[PDB]
Structures are given as C-alpha cells and as structure tokens.
Amino acid sequence: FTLNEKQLTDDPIDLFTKWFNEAKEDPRETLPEAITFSSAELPSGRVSSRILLFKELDHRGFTIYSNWGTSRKAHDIATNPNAAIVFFWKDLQRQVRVEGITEHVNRETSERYFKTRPRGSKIGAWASRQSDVIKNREELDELTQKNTERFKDAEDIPCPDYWGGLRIVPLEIEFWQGRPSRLHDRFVYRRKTENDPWKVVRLAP
Amino acid sequence: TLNEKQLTDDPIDLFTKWFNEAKEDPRETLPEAITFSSAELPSGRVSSRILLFKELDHRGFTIYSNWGTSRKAHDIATNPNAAIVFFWKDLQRQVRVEGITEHVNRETSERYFKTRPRGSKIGAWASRQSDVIKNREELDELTQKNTERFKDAEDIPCPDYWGGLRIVPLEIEFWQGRPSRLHDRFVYRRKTENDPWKVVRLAP
Numbered sequence: 001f002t003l004n005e006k007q008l009t010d011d012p013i014d015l016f017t018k019w020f021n022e023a024k025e026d027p028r029e030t031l032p033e034a035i036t037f038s039s040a041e042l043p044s045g046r047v048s049s050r051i052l053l054f055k056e057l058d059h060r061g062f063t064i065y066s067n068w069g070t071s072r073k074a075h076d077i078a079t080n081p082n083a084a085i086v087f088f089w090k091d092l093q094r095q096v097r098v099e100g101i102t103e104h105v106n107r108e109t110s111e112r113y114f115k116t117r118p119r120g121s122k123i124g125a126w127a128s129r130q131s132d133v134i135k136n137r138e139e140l141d142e143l144t145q146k147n148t149e150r151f152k153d154a155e156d157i158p159c160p161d162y163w164g165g166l167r168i169v170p171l172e173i174e175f176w177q178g179r180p181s182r183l184h185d186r187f188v189y190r191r192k193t194e195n196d197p198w199k200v201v202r203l204a205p
Numbered sequence: 206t207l208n209e210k211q212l213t214d215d216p217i218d219l220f221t222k223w224f225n226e227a228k229e230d231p232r233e234t235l236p237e238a239i240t241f242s243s244a245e246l247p248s249g250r251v252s253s254r255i256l257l258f259k260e261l262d263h264r265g266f267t268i269y270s271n272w273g274t275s276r277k278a279h280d281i282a283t284n285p286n287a288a289i290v291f292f293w294k295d296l297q298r299q300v301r302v303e304g305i306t307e308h309v310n311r312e313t314s315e316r317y318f319k320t321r322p323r324g325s326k327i328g329a330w331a332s333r334q335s336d337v338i339k340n341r342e343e344l345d346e347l348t349q350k351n352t353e354r355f356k357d358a359e360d361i362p363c364p365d366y367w368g369g370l371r372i373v374p375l376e377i378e379f380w381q382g383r384p385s386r387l388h389d390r391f392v393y394r395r396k397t398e399n400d401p402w403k404v405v406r407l408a409p
C-alpha cells in the first residue's frame with residue numbers, strides 16, 4: 001500500500017495488471033472494473049462523463065464495450081478521439097488514471113464478445129437507442145417487447161452496428177496511492193506519442 | 206425507483222434528497238467522492254481524477270482543491286467547462302453534473318481553508334500539486350521546511366492557488382439502475398444558466 005520507484009515496472013501495463021489483479025483478489029473491492037469514462041466535444045470543449053466497466057487490455061490499449069454510435073459519448077468521441085478513464089479503489093486507497101487517444105475495436109471482436117452477453121442483454125442492445133430521448137418506461141418496454149418478439153424466432157441475436165468495443169491508447173497513465181498523511185505517492189508514465197518511449201516521474205500530491 | 210412523479214422543479218432538490226439518502230445510508234461510506242473531469246480546450250485532451258464534493262451554493266456545485274498549478278487548473282484555465290459524477294454503487298445510483306466552471310469567492314476559499322486541520326493547511330503550502338519532484342525526500346524536505354516555516358504562527362495563511370471552484374450546471378442527470386438493465390434515466394437541461402430547466406427521459 002505504498003508505492004516507490006523500486007516497484008515501478010518498465011511497461012506501465014505491468015503495474016496496472018498487478019494492481020488490478022490485487023483489486024479483484026480483494027473482497028473489499030466488489031467492482032474493480034468500474035471506471036469513469038470521460039470525454040469531451042472538441043469544438044465546444046464541453047465535458048461529459050459516465051460510469052462504465054473496463055473489459056480488458058489488448059495489444060494496444062484499454063478496452064471498454066458500449067454503444068459508440070448514437071450515445072452522447074459516441075458523439076464526443078466522433079468529434080474528438082481523446083478520452084480518459086479512472087479506476088478508483090476506495091478501500092485500497094488507489095486510483096489509476098489512463099489518458100490517451102481512442103480507437104474503435106475490431107468489428108470481429110466487437111461481435112465475438114457481443115455473443116457471450118446474455119440473451120436478454122443482446123436484445124436490450126437493439127431495443128434501446130442509448131441516450132436517445134423517450135416518452136416513458138412504456139415506450140421503452142414496447143420496444144423491448146417488440147424486439148423480444150422480433151428476435152423470438154432466432155438462436156443467436158445479431159450485433160447492432162452502434163454497439164461494440166472502443167480502446168484507449170494510453171499517452172498518460174498515473175498510479176496514485178493515498179496515505180492518511182495526505183502525502184500520497186504519485187507516479188505518472190507518459191509518451192507524447194504512441195511511438196515514444198514511456199517516461200516515469202513523481203508528481204506532488 | 207425513479208419516475209416522473211418523483212421529479213422536482215429544481216433539479217437541485219432531487220440532488221439533495223438523493224445525496225442525503227446516500228449520507229444516511231451506511232453502505233455508502235464516502236458519498237461526496239466524485240470524478241472531476243476536465244479537458245484542455247485547444248487540443249481536446251481529457252483528464253480526470255477523484256475529488257470530494259463540498260457543497261452547493263447559490264449558483265452551483267462546489268469543490269475545493271488546487272486550482273492554480275495543478276493539471277485540472279491548466280485545463281480549466283483554457284476551458285471553463287467541467288463534469289462530475291457521483292456514483293453510489295450500492296444504491297445503484299449515479300448523478301451527472303455538467304456545466305461551466307467558476308472560481309469561488311476568495312473569502313469563502315479562505316474561510317474553509319481555515320477549518321482544515323493544521324497538518325493540512327501546511328500541506329497545501331509544501332505541495333505544489335501535480336508538479337514533478339525527485340522523490341519522497343524532496344517532498345518531506347518541503348513539508349519539514351514549511352512545518353518549520355509556519356511553526357511560529359497560530360493560523361496558517363491560504364495559498365493563492367488553493368480555493369474553491371464551482372460548476373454552474375447546464376445538465377444534471379439522475380440515473381437509477383435496475384438489474385433489468387432498463388435503468389431509469391432523467392436529465393435536466395438549459396442551454397444557458399438563464400434558461401428554464403427541461404426534464405426528459407433518456408434511453409438506458
């Protein structure tokens with residue numbers, strides 16, 4: 001629960017997995033994949049944020065699955081391929097900050113993981129046009145019902161074009177470890193480019 | 206749950222209600238914890254970190270921290286826009302505030318800085334938030350120096366870079382999750398701080 005130069009890895013991704021695995025191992029942390037996905041609309045510079053679940057890392061960055069077509073976050077990203085996510089483990093007094101450029105995950109993978117999702121979920125994807133305005137619950141259910149009936153005669157439910165994965169290619173990753181002393185341990189890895197060697201530094205809390 | 210009937214006129218009412226419930230709930234041990242998101246306006250780079258919500262005032266949501274030298278200060282400086290999320294895991298609730306930022310009154314800033322513990326007051330001075338340092342040692346050297354610097358002093362002065370900042374809401378969303386995945390979503394909006402609030406139901 002302390003963080004020092006000695007513990008730092010070469011690839012920040014190592015220290016992430018270590019910390020993440022510890023969070024999953026810890027029974028105090030009941031939802032370690034929960035994160036805050038922040039985005040912003042580039043022309044105006046308006047910031048929006050919401051809670052999502054981190055899915056997994058891949059060859060290039062951090063991946064998260066949701067509706068990246070019609071939702072608010074989709075419209076921000078569409079105008080500005082930049083995003084930030086925070087992992088906050090209250091009890092472990094740890095917080096990880098990832099900040100990088102966004103990329104749409106492979107259409108195959110997007111579909112692959114969409115299949116694993118429960119049937120009720122697969123259908124919900126279709127029925128709900130995330131972030132769109134509606135009249136009420138009724139309108140919502142009417143849609144669920146219609147779709148549940150629409151795909152009733154069908155083994156595997158198809159994946160919507162607007163649903164899938166998106167990945168954040170890190171340009172900055174910060175490992176923050178709090179101490180009741182208020183003098184928390186702060187370390188941040190950075191590279192101006194996805195092709196620049198990572199650089200670690202200690203930040204004042 | 207969450208239905209049209211429960212909606213208030215001033216979103217701020219529904220907020221307090223929800224917040225008070227979170228404080229009342231022993232499951233929610235840190236209901237003031239929030240994610241404060243900001244973005245550097247020219248480049249459009251997004252940064253975010255965890256902070257504590259302090260309280261509302263006549264105009265918006267206030268948070269106290271270093272709004273001068275820190276990363277968030279540099280984002281806000283270039284783009285007076287921010288967003289914060291309140292997430293109460295157990296209550297299955299999340300509140301989203303999105304508005305323009307404003308620097309809280311210098312008096313208030315100082316007033317609340319006084320209430321903070323002495324160790325804290327000193328820490329504000331010693332630590333140049335987000336600045337790069339060599340190691341813990343450099344840090345402590347600074348703490349020690351400041352602890353000694355302000356040793357001969359009753360009340361410790363407030364740094365210019367420390368204080369409060371408020372978010373004047375343009376969008377407030379009340380999200381209530383249901384294991385059914387068909388969460389209740391309501392969002393209040395006004396294009397301007399002088400435009401009547403407007404409630405609407407969003408698809409989950």
Ligand SMILES: Cc1cc2nc3c(=O)[nH]c(=O)nc-3n(C[C@H](O)[C@H](O)[C@H](O)COP(=O)(O)O)c2cc1C
Pocket residue numbers: 034049050051052053065066067071072073074130131299380382409
């Ligand atoms: C713990 C938690 C997990 C969530 N996971 C997801 C998810 O995997 N996919 C998704 O689309 N929305 C998810 N949501 C919903 C979003 O927080 C929220 O509905 C948001 O509005 C979605 O996009 P928007 O901000 O662009 O409207 C989750 C919410 C919570 C509280």
Ligand SMILES: Cc1cc2nc3c(=O)[nH]c(=O)nc-3n(C[C@H](O)[C@H](O)[C@H](O)COP(=O)(O)O)c2cc1C
Pocket residue numbers: 093094095176178205238253254255256257269270271275276277278334335
């Ligand atoms: C639970 C929690 C509460 C925090 N509260 C505060 C706070 O009240 N003020 C502050 O300046 N930083 C606070 N921090 C630290 C910030 O999240 C983080 O160090 C951030 O980097 C500060 O500003 P920056 O993003 O501009 O560097 C808190 C962190 C955690 C995990």
